[PDB]
A paper describes a structure:
Finally, the 1.45 Å high-resolution structure of [name] was determined, and the final structural model was refined to Rwork = 19.75% and Rfree= 20.36%. The crystal belonged to space group P41212 and contained a single molecule in the asymmetric unit (ASU). The final structural model covered most of [name] (residues M1 to Y86), excluding the last two C-terminal amino acids due to unclear electron density. The structure of [name] consisted of four α-helices (α1–α4). Two major long helices in the centre (α2 and α3) is covered by two short helices from N- and C-terminal parts (α1 and α4). B-factor analysis highlighted high rigidity, with low B-factor values (average 25.3 Å) for most of the structure, except the α3 region (average 48.2 Å), underscoring the rigid conformation of the [name] protein in solution. In addition, the other selected proteins also exhibited low Z-scores (around 5.9–5.6) and sequence identity (2–12%), indicating that the [name] structure is novel, whose fold has not been reported previously. During the structural refinement step, we found a big round-shape electron density, which exhibited a typical metal ion density, around the α3–α4 connecting loop region of [name]. This metal ion density was coordinated by oxygens from the main chain of E39, I42 and G44. To reveal the identity of this metal ion, we used inductively coupled plasma mass spectrometry (ICP-MS). This analysis indicated that Zn2+ was the metal ion, with a detected concentration of 105.3 ppb (μg/kg).
[name] is classified as an anti-[name] protein renowned for its capacity to impede the DNA cleavage activity inherent to the Cas9 enzyme. Our current study reveals that [name] is a metalloprotein that contains Zn2+ and abolishes the cleavage activity of Cas9 only from Streptococcus pyrogen ([name]) by directly interacting with the [name] domain of [name]. Furthermore, we demonstrate that the [name] interaction prevents the target DNA from being loaded onto Cas9. Finally, based on our observations, we concluded that [name] can inhibit the DNA-cleavage activity of [name] by directly interacting with the [name] domain, which then can prevent the target DNA from being loaded into the Cas9 active site.
Author numbering: 1 to 86
Write the structure that this text describes.
């Protein structure tokens, strides 16, 4: 679904935020997404999962200044994962 910012706006933001801050956000997204993959198809959400989720949300807001939402986060993830290698 359409995101709160355009695709072009999101690209241009990621041409402005520093590479080190982008990498920070990539790593916290990567850690969350990996844990989500382990728990996606089974009951419950572990305390570890919740901890990683909360970290990701906090880093998202710190690095981007954008109120967290799942769709704009996805669009940012796709851009970050294209650039960075865990
Ligand atoms: Zn689950």
């Amino acid at each position: 679904m359409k995101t709160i910012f355009t695709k072009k706006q999101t690209e241009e933001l990621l041409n402005d935020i520093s590479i080190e801050k982008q990498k920070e956000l990539f790593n916290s997204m990567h850690d969350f997404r990996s844990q989500h993959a382990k728990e996606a198809r089974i009951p419950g959400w572990s305390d570890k999962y919740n901890k990683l989720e909360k970290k990701m949300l906090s880093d998202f807001e710190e690095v981007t200044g954008i109120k967290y939402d799942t769709l704009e986060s996805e669009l940012i993830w796709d851009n970050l994962s294209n650039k960075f290698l865990y």
